């Protein structure tokens, strides 16, 4: 039906909202600290002087254990 | 349709997993460092000296802003 359709819709973009901003291909699992802006993986995190969402300086990158994470 | 409630469902186990392990009923937006478990509301992790996943001890707790919240 066109609910179906609907659903399928929500479902894309909460999946969309869980991979990371930057590369759009790997799941979030890092956090910038200490702003605390959680949207990239650790691939392109480990390539970030500024935070891509508020631009503060990353001091560090905290790695995160969600439970939603998925795999292969 | 049968798709629909099979959707249904996975909407409803996504959305489910992102509320607090220790209350059920708040959104997940805090993390233990530094084993980096992230399963508790700030409310719920505020007090909580080991991590209740890991037992890692926990030195601070980092507040995190998800696209998902
Ligand atoms: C565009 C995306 O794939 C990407 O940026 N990849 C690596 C990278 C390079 C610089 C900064 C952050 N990430
Ligand atoms: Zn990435
Ligand atoms: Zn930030
Ligand atoms: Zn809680
Ligand atoms: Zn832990």
Redesign the pocket.
């Given at each position: 039906s066109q609910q179906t359709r609907v659903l399928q819709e929500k479902l894309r973009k909460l999946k969309e909202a869980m991979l990371?901003m930057?590369?759009?291909?790997e799941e979030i699992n890092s956090t910038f600290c200490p702003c605390g802006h959680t949207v990239?993986c650790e691939?392109?995190?480990?390539?970030?002087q500024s935070c891509?969402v508020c631009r503060s300086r990353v001091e560090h990158v905290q790695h995160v254990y969600l439970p939603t994470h998925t795999s292969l």
């Amino acid at each position: 039906s066109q609910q179906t359709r609907v659903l399928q819709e929500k479902l894309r973009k909460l999946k969309e909202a869980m991979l990371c901003m930057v590369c759009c291909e790997e799941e979030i699992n890092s956090t910038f600290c200490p702003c605390g802006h959680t949207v990239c993986c650790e691939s392109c995190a480990a390539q970030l002087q500024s935070c891509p969402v508020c631009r503060s300086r990353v001091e560090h990158v905290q790695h995160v254990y969600l439970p939603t994470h998925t795999s292969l």
